[PDB]
From a paper:
[name], a multifunctional metalloenzyme, catalyzes the dehydration of 2-phosphoglycerate (2-PGA) to phosphoenolpyruvate (PEP) through the intermediacy of a stabilized carbanion. Herein, we present novel crystal structures of [name] [name] in complex with [name] and its oxidized derivative, KSF where the C5 hemiaminal is oxidized to an imide carbonyl unit.
The hydroxyl group of [name], analogous to the C-3-OH of 2-PGA, makes an extensive series of hydrogen bonds with Glu167, Lys392, and His369. No formation of Schiff base-like adducts between Lys341 and the hemiaminal moiety of [name] were observed in this structure. Taken together with our structural data it is plausible that the slow dissociation of [name] is coupled with ordering of the catalytic loop (Loop 2) that covers the entrance to the binding pocket and thereby locks the inhibitor into the cavity and increases its residence time.
Author numbering:
A (entry chain B), B (entry chain A): -7 to 430
The structure:
């Protein structure tokens, strides 16, 4: 007899704009407005060590604005043709909305409008549709995911010591992370992260080392080896009153594609030694023997599938092996990885593929195969906390959203705290059990 | 005959919670919910080099949580006594809401509930009431301020090189900043900042200096003197293709309190040389003749009032002299400063005094005496962008909200971008003429 406003979920307006990300580079933000007055707003993140098979960002390449990194053309895609194609459509139909943008762009890698333009609209849409349905984003996402009412709070892998490309040290491994698997709630996990992070600063200050931070809020001190990184962390964990290996485990992102040349892995700060696939795998195995490293990400080059089959054979029963640049959140690639015994986990980055619908498809493929899914940030982030709702709504079980500093990271932890406060034990923090091989 | 929901502006619930700030320390967030369904949310920032006379930030001191920096007591204050005193009150009456909290705390420095508790609610209340009136925060702020429909976009001062206490170098001056006075819009100002910040990273790398960032997203490289901080900024400005003095002026925060002992200013990075108050003023003066430094903040110790009078005589006709620790956003102190010819500008930090109403009284006192007001962040921030709305809605003319990295900073620039998009020339960017002494 009376039609409520929630039923008026047709798109009446889409606005795009150029804003600034956490590294000072432009990004695209979109607003999606519905007939009933609901609005969602979202922005695209941006990677610094991008896989070669990622969907493509659209930048302007004008050297007189933002050193060629403007996104005014992606913004005009949002305001002109994306807007045109979606006005009149039901935001609640996420898949239909995404399919429209994908077909209109027409390219394999979203190179006409940019995966940045398309993703920002895909996420803003989902938020507008959640508002129209009278629910928080995490709840809407679970329904779009095919898993209505099923939540978990994820176990975070928190970056605290950095190496590799553009880190003034002899550390080759791009990220060393702590995971507070002994916490009972995500709120306690976050407190634990914070305590270790502040104790690490004290440790590094006592060694004379630098405590300024990188892109992800963690430290990049002048260390002498990949091993010294694991030791300062061990020292910080103990000063915080926690036990390495039962309260807190360790995870790594090697970003090994960055040090792979002419078929060998070159460890620039490890006497500059060169390694085969098989040898770099054994170098990693030994590290997991000396330290409670339970997860290793991109331990070989994104094209070294023979090498990944062997790493999975050696380490996979015991260690989570996370493909990032390996799978680029792409179902066509993940599929083949699964069929070939390649890795046992996937890092989920929605701007690697460019839409929410295809991101949920990757999570689903992974879970169907017994692979774990770790929801992730990019180096370039914004104040947007969408990956927190996403992690909870897909019950992914793990998240990777930075150190315990910079609001580009901390906003996601804050949102995890608001969501857990609301769900309580309807969103269990499962701890060590989430991690492939425990 | 029918009442809108907007008229149901009575408070029905206030929730407080403990979240995390951009340094990894706890802070207070509050939600104010009104009968008509309107909700506002805000969080208190936190200083790192606080004035002696700031209102009190209440922390817990429990070593078992966050190294003693929990805010559960301030949170309990929000949830219990503050909520009980505000339920049933009209959120549109900001002065009346704040008065209730102030009278109920009962202390001069808000040391019973914490200025962090009271501020979070004061801001949250204002946001909820903005929504209840059907308007953006900046517009509501202008109406609260007694200046309805009067707006400007602030000229930002952007902190790109760091020294002082939280900086691992021999630069004594806490902050070196650029101001893009030559810009025509804030959007362009922001673009200029980003470009200069990226060119600075290249300049610093070519000198083999570290390009990681401190709390405010600026660089803290190992420079030999205070003057060398100015010189590398001028390389970066030129390498970005801008003209120092015309497109971009310079500003500084001395935080000179931090290096005052036994009545002298000791510059650890001009080889421990001790300066009388007047010689330090001469030191500053000499920098302003070498570089187009147009603003100097906290150039003497907060209690060195005779020094400040002197500094005002020497510098105040040509240079903006900003009291931060000197005035602590406190009308009692600022009044006395106005009376004594002390400074000509005030840094406005709402958590130094504890309420929006008292903040607006500080801005008004400044402007009534011809002093400029610069709305400011603290080192410890969140994803909250309230100071952008506050700057525009009071037409303050200036903002200090950090470097062009970290979303604890960039969120504020982004919100300035959204506001300028909505207002256009209803919110002029006035450029250099905002700065006291031009
Ligand atoms: O490889 C990476 C970088 P990127 O910016 O996403 O490339 C940061 C992220 O933690 N991760 O897994
Ligand atoms: O003195 C200060 C520090 P604080 O954290 O607020 O003390 C950072 C800010 O720019 N300002 O003016
Ligand atoms: Mg990468
Ligand atoms: Mg990675
Ligand atoms: Mg200070
Ligand atoms: Mg200051």
């Amino acid at each position: 007899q009376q039609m409520g406003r929630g039923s008026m979920s047709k798109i009446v307006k889409i606005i795009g704009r150029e804003i600034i990300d956490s590294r000072g580079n432009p990004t695209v933000e979109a607003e999606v407005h519905l007939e009933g007055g609901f609005v969602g707003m979202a922005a695209a993140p941006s990677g610094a060590s991008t896989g070669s098979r990622e969907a493509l960002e659209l930048r302007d390449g004008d050297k007189s604005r933002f050193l060629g990194k403007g996104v005014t053309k992606a913004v005009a895609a949002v305001n002109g043709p994306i807007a045109q194609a979606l006005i009149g459509k039901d935001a609640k139909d996420q898949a239909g909305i995404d399919k429209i943008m994908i077909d209109l762009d027409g390219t394999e890698n979203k190179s006409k409008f940019g995966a940045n333009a398309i993703l920002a609209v895909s996420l803003a849409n989902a938020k507008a549709a959640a508002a129209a349905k009278g629910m928080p984003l995490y709840e809407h996402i679970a329904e779009l995911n095919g898993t209505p009412g099923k939540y978990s709070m994820p176990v975070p892998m928190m970056n605290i010591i950095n190496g590799g490309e553009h880190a003034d040290n002899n550390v080759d491994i791009q990220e060393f992370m702590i995971q507070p698997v002994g916490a009972k709630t995500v709120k306690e996990a976050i407190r634990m992260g914070s305590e270790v992070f502040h104790h690490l600063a004290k440790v590094l200050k006592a060694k004379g080392m630098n405590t300024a931070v990188g892109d992800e809020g963690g430290y990049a001190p002048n260390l002498g080896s990949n091993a010294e990184a694991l030791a300062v962390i061990a020292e910080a964990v103990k000063a915080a009153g926690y036990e390495l290996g039962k309260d807190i485990t360790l995870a790594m992102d090697c970003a090994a594609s960055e040090f792979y040349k002419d078929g060998k892995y070159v460890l620039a700060g490890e006497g500059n030694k060169a390694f085969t696939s098989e040898e770099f795998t054994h170098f990693l195995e030994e590290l997991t023997k000396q330290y409670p490293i339970v997860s290793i990400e991109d331990g070989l080059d994104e094209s070294d599938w023979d090498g990944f089959a062997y790493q999975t054979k050696v380490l996979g029963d015991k260690i989570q092996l996370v493909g990032d640049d390996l799978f680029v959140t792409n179902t066509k690639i993940l599929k083949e990885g699964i069929e070939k015994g390649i890795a046992n986990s996937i890092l989920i980055k929605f701007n690697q593929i460019g839409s929410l619908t295809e991101t949920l498809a990757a999570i689903k493929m992974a879970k169907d195969a017994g692979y774990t899914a770790v929801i992730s940030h990019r180096s370039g982030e914004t104040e947007d906390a969408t990956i927190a709702d996403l992690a909870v709504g897909t019950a992914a079980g793990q998240i990777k959203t930075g150190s315990m500093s910079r609001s580009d990271r901390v906003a996601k932890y804050n949102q995890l705290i608001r969501i857990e406060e609301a769900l309580g034990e309807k969103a269990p923090y499962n701890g060590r059990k989430e991690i492939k091989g425990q």
